[PDB]
Paper text:
Lipoproteins in gram-negative bacteria are sorted to the outer membrane (OM) via the localization of lipoproteins (Lol) export pathway. Here, we report cryo-EM structures of LolCDE in apo, lipoprotein-bound, and AMPPNP-bound states at a resolution of 3.5 to 4.2 Å. Our studies snapshot 3 functional states of LolCDE in a transport cycle, providing deep insights into the mechanisms that underlie LolCDE-mediated lipoprotein sorting in E. coli.
To reveal the interaction details of RcsF-LolCDE, RcsF was coexpressed with LolCDE to attain a 1:1 stoichiometry for structure determination. This allowed us to obtain a 3.5-Å cryo-EM map for RcsF-LolCDE. In the V-shaped cavity, the 3 acyl chains of RcsF straddles the TMD interface of LolC and LolE, with 1 acyl chain, R1, residing on the LoopLolC side, and the other two, R2 and R3, extending to the LoopLolE side. Importantly, the proteinaceous part of RcsF extends from the V-shaped cavity and appears only on the LoopLolC side, suggesting that RcsF might enter the cavity laterally via the LoopLolC-TM2LolE interface. Of the 14 visible residues of RcsF in the RcsF-LolCDE structure, only 3 residues, Cys+1, Ser+2, and Met+3, are enclosed by the V-shaped cavity of LolCDE. A close examination of the RcsF-LolCDE structure reveals that the side chains of Glu263LolC and Asp264LolE clamp Cys+1 of RcsF from opposite directions and are located right in the center of the cavity.
Residue numbers in the entry:
A (entry chain D), E (entry chain F): 2 to 230
B (entry chain A): 21 to 34
C (entry chain E): 4 to 412
D (entry chain C): 2 to 397
Write the structure that this text describes.
């Protein structure tokens, strides 16, 4: 069936023998291109470790991930950086901003690493700033900013390069309604026009229930994997 | 050696 | 112990091995290098002082009284008057010639000293430095001469060899021509130091008096002090007792450059190695700053229990002071292991690297000596701890006035 | 375009303006390297000045090099001065050198006889006191003694001294008779140097005839060197056929060798400072990585290669080393050649010149580059570890 | 009336201008000696910051606190440390223990700061161990211990010197029922014999109904103030 992505027995072990608790064994997932997959669950239930492993940061102990016949482990680390830079969008739980860099510099960092010419990237950044309307705070330090502001800076940084997969671990957990409504509207037009895949894990039942596809990782067992269409 | 430059004759015998 | 033992648990609380314990190892290496090499330097210069005390200033005439106009007519009265001056341990007469020493077609111009053996025995420890000679058969009126090692090896001569000595004996009359060519028998070989053996050659005083055909007179009086560091004014006062026409000389004028060089080198070592310990204390400052930034939670827990605003500072001061103690002791161990086997270490280095260090006679001791004065070790270790405390004081004050809850939220 | 790691590395070195102490902690390595390079530069300049004074007082007043013949004396007609061309040599003058014994009416001494032509000036000529250089005519047996040598000999102007050379001795049934001649002193040379203790000046003809050389011959050509302390390298040059090269290393070499070995020693005794400072850099990174790993993780989720994280930490280490070395060398140059100004305001122990200062830019550049290289070697390891260590293992 | 502590219009601000929120105005509280007061409310309703301010860790932004006629602002830090060490007992939300010390050392620390002689603290620790029954924990490491045990050791540390004011921010969150009943009994005899005032802030309404006095901080008005006795 699926050819673009093939995940087989994604597992992680970092302990000795006979001490590893049998939480998950022979767990496989069906990841499809173009679809906005959402995962539901509770905090501290072992959801962040897998998504950190899904970013290509670490090599899985068991199982294989195949992209049209090319293993990542035999593939060079430069290709892994390329995948993490222009193919995959990754967000941590926290803001994890860079205090030594300004908000504009942190936003342009995904492009700055991408070795793109300053002219067009700066023009697009200025146009985006004019569209948003947050031009006033450009030289101020991230340390003296609020949680919602830095969280939205992190979201913008994640959406600068327009990755195919934008992984967002509770992007509105630290957001109040004033920023949350704008973030949800932004995600709405991104899904309507751009259509980039978002992996949004959030706790609210009502918001996640409206989604076409819902995956559940509870107690390490495939309990709820529902697709209406 | 290096500071050998000592005034070789500082005696000024009184 | 005292309630500050927290520092111990803050120092032994090391986990996640690698690049968190390597820091302490590197800081210990820096402190140990600085302290150990400072101790080795100080001990080597103490050994230099000891070797100068034994080999050079204990054989040279500490004071010199030379008549300028005529040879001393009443040297006996002056000798008795100066021997009773306090601060003088001994006195003796001497006569100072200079002549052509010749043997085996090899010729040199060397200074010759004539002194009574039984008096020069009291005057200095010079005869104790003779490699080998007949201390009983060495007397006057036997054509006996004793030669330093340098002159002997430059003349290719050994013990029991005949040597020609040419003396001018110039006079206003026609007797100045045909300089006296006497013969002498070599009886001993001196081994003083890297420089002194190349110039000293002695004959008995009565032999010198017979060789010049002069009366009962000597060319000067040599003096041995009890305290040597103030020999200038002492010999000036001693010569003031006799006639004022005489010329006074002190061994200070000749060998005070050695004292000032030893003191200057010790000061240079101390200052440079204080700089080294200061850099290692920069390491300690960094380590304690990171310790504060990593244990802010623990110090907050301590402060919410009613800790004083000087208690946290004391915790981190002793943390730094203990980090200093570890390196300082690890360096003192090397500074005591070295400086006691320092001479064999230098010999092994010479075997490994074919290059002689203190030889070549432009210094006063071919080898490198060593002597460990534990007062110097105490001074070095107190210097290291004081520098560590000065380093640790400001990060401690920084830790004392920070509340993580107040600044993070 | 410049590497992107340069921006991040240069930006981590700054900041922390809310406390003004973390920046000082990060610049401690630069301050230590600066202090070490300062000490190295100033003490090496002082010792270079001291050995320059020795060179201008010991070697500056004695034959710096001698080109002679392989067997016997040198024939000026056979080897003209016009053909005597070599590197580093800026002046060549005929000379005869000998080891002599001087017997006076009062005492005897040993010295070095320099037979020179009066028409050519010598570094000894400006120091002559009430004695005309041209007064050393041939056949007159004219000798000028050093002040200390004259005091040792106990003679003055108008007094005769018997000069003898044992190297030109003649063997007979009456023993070996060294060559001897009476010489008339017409003054003293006052230089306040070790050379004045044993060196005397005579006319070249008288000395040449005295060493039992054939008439008209000379011992050799005295060669002045722009850099005589490197004479050993100049000892390996191509020489004219039938000639041999000798230098001061025969007589005053070991002393100078020792001096260099001294300089070199105080050359490591202070270099250890920057060596310790190198270790300091390690600790800084070994802390700063631990203080910024949570940020490196973010840089790892972006396109930065681990080999580029190693670059962004090594460039910070190298920037600290370069700033420290350059600023320390600058303040060493600014502080040296100025100690002679600061010393007067306090007690002075030395007499005459306060502190000789000879700043050779080559030495300063070499030691600054060595400090930079040691800083790079120190910063290589923590940078590599930060590159190779994933954040998860350190955090978990 | 209360004499040791006098609070007038206690207010707390933790922000700068502009974004400052006017949520609290003219709110003062009644702390009575011998009575165990309980504070109820929802998350993010200023339940933890106020409890932090009562401990003297920071200076209150508005209002006056008088301790026996000595203003806190002019009061030296040594007096505040003495108050926090000998008279007031504070319990944090989280564990906030010392990982390098054993449980015995963590219990002993409050009096060790007080420069007390080792004998009585050692005797107290030994008596506590004998009476409770932690003799079984002789080979285990303090770091690898459980959560309920460490929380209860924190409580024991807070109860070493029997402070007059015992502030407990969620004392039963990490404690199970088998520990909860024992902690409630312990609080019972401490209140009966020592009579120390307890300021227990906890979220469960059903369990908080069991407290002697319940106070309500809703909409900035003192609406519900119930005292059983
Ligand atoms: C490692 C192998 C062993 C080597 C043995 C070498 C021993 C030689 C020295 C012995 C001294 C003998 C005493 C008699 C000396 C004498 O007669 N006459 C004189 C002969 O000329 C002494 S000159 C004294 C020299 C000596 O130089 C030495 O120090 C050598 C010391 C070594 C002594 C040997 C003991 C063992 C320690 C070895 C150290 C190496 C550690 C290894 C680390 C792994 O000092 C000087 O350079 C003179 C001072 C000139 C410089 C003045 C500087 C002015 C400062 C201006 C202010 C600037 C601002 C600065 C701050 C920013």
């Amino acid at each position: 069936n699926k050819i673009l992505l093939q995940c087989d027995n994604l597992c992680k072990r970092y302990q000795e023998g006979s001490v590893q608790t049998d939480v998950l064994h022979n767990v496989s997932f069906s990841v499809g291109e173009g679809e906005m997959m959402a995962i539901v669950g509770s905090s501290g239930s072992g959801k962040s470790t897998l998504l950190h492993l899904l970013g290509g940061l670490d090599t899985p102990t068991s199982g294989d991930v195949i992209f049209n016949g090319q293993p990542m482990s035999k593939l060079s680390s430069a290709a892994k950086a390329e995948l993490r830079n222009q193919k995959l969008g990754f967000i941590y739980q926290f803001h994890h901003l860079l205090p030594d860099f300004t908000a504009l510099e942190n936003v342009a960092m995904p492009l700055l690493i991408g070795k793109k010419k300053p002219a067009e990237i700066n023009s697009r950044a200025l146009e985006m700033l004019k569209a948003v309307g947050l031009d006033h705070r450009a030289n101020h330090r991230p340390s003296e900013l609020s949680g919602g502001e830095r969280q939205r800076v992190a979201i913008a940084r994640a959406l600068v390069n327009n990755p195919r997969l934008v992984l967002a671990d509770e992007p509105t957990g630290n957001l109040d309604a004033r920023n949350a409504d704008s973030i949800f509207q932004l995600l709405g037009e991104l899904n309507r026009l751009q259509g980039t895949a978002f992996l949004v894990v959030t706790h609210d039942l009502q918001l996640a229930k409206r989604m076409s596809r819902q995956l559940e990782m509870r107690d390490g067992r495939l309990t709820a994997e529902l697709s209406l269409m | 050696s290096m500071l050998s430059r000592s005034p070789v004759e500082p005696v000024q015998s009184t | 112990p005292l309630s500050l033992l927290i520092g111990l648990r803050f120092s032994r609380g090391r986990r996640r091995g690698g690049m968190v314990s390597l820091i302490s190892v590197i800081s210990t290496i820096g402190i140990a290098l600085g302290v150990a090499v400072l101790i080795v330097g100080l001990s080597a210069m103490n050994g230099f002082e000891r070797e100068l005390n034994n080999r050079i200033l204990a054989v040279v005439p500490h004071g010199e009284i030379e008549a300028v106009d005529q040879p001393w007519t009443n040297w006996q009265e002056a000798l008795d008057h100066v021997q009773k001056v306090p601060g003088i341990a001994a006195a003796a007469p001497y006569i100072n010639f200079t002549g052509l020493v010749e043997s085996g077609a090899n010729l040199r111009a060397i200074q010759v000293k004539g002194v009574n053996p039984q008096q020069e025995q009291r005057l200095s420890a010079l005869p104790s430095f003779v490699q080998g000679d007949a201390w009983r058969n060495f007397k006057a009126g036997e054509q006996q001469i004793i030669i330093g090692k340098g002159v002997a090896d430059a003349l290719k001569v050994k013990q029991g060899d005949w040597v020609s000595i040419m003396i001018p004996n110039s006079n206003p009359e026609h007797k100045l021509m045909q300089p006296k060519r006497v013969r002498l028998h070599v009886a001993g070989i001196l081994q003083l130091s890297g420089q002194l053996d190349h110039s000293f050659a002695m004959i008995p005083l009565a032999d010198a008096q017979q060789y010049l055909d002069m009366g009962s007179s000597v060319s000067g009086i040599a003096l041995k002090m009890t305290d040597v560091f103030n020999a200038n004014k002492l010999v000036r006062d001693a010569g003031e007792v006799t006639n004022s026409y005489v010329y006074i000389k002190s061994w200070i004028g000749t060998y005070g450059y050695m004292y000032r060089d030893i003191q200057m080198i010790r000061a240079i070592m101390y200052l440079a190695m204080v700089l080294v310990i200061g850099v290692a204390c920069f390491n300690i400052v960094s380590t304690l700053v990171m310790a504060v930034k990593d244990k802010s939670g623990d110090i907050a827990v301590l402060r919410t229990l009613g800790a004083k605003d000087g208690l946290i500072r004391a915790i981190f001061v002793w943390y730094g002071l203990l980090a200093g103690l570890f390196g300082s002791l690890c360096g003192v161990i090397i500074g005591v292991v070295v400086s006691l086997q320092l001479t064999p270490i230098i010999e092994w280095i010479e075997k490994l690297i074919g290059h002689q260090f203190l030889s070549s006679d432009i210094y006063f001791i071919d080898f490198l000596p060593s002597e460990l004065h534990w007062l110097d070790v105490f001074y070095v270790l107190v210097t290291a701890l004081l520098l560590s405390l000065l380093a640790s004081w400001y990060p401690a004050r920084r830790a004392s006035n920070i509340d993580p809850a107040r600044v993070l939220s | 375009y410049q590497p992107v790691a340069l921006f991040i590395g240069l930006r981590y070195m700054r900041g922390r303006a809310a406390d003004r102490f973390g920046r000082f902690v990060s610049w401690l390595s630069t301050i230590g390297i600066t202090l070490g390079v300062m000490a190295l530069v100033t003490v090496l300049s002082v010792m270079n000045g001291f050995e320059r004074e020795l060179q201008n007082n010991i070697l500056g007043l004695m034959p710096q090099a001698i080109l002679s013949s392989e067997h016997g004396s040198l024939n000026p007609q056979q080897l003209p001065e016009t053909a005597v061309k070599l590197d580093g040599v800026n002046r060549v003058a005929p000379i005869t050198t000998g080891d002599v014994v001087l017997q006076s009416a009062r005492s005897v001494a040993v010295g070095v006889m320099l037979g020179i032509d009066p028409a050519q000036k010598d570094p000894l000529t400006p120091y002559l006191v009430n004695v005309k250089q041209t007064d050393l005519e041939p056949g007159k047996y004219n000798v000028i003694l050093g002040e200390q040598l004259a005091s040792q000999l106990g003679v003055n102007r108008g007094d005769q001294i018997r000069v003898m050379v044992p190297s030109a001795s003649q063997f007979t049934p009456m023993g070996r008779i060294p060559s001897q001649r009476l010489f008339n002193v017409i003054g003293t040379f006052a230089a306040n140097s070790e050379v004045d203790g044993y060196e005397m000046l005579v006319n070249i003809e008288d000395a040449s005839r005295l060493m039992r050389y054939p008439a008209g011959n000379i011992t050799g050509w005295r060669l002045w060197l722009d850099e005589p302390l490197k004479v050993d390298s100049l000892s390996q040059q191509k020489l004219p056929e039938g000639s041999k090269w000798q230098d001061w290393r025969d007589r005053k070499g070991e002393l100078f060798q020792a001096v260099r070995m001294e300089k070199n020693m105080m050359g490591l005794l202070l270099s250890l400072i920057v060596a310790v400072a190198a270790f300091n850099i390690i600790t800084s990174l070994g802390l700063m990585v631990m203080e910024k790993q949570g940020e490196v993780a973010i840089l790892q989720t972006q396109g930065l290669t681990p080999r580029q994280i190693m670059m962004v930490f090594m460039v910070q280490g190298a920037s600290a080393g370069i700033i420290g070395a350059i600023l320390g060398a600058a303040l060493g140059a600014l502080l040296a050649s100025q100690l002679n100004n600061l010393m007067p305001i306090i007690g002075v122990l030395l007499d005459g010149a306060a502190l000789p200062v000879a700043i050779e830019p080559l030495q300063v550049i070499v030691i600054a580059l060595v400090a930079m290289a040691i800083a790079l070697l120190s910063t290589l390891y923590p940078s590599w570890r930060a590159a190779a260590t994933q954040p998860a293992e350190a955090l978990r």
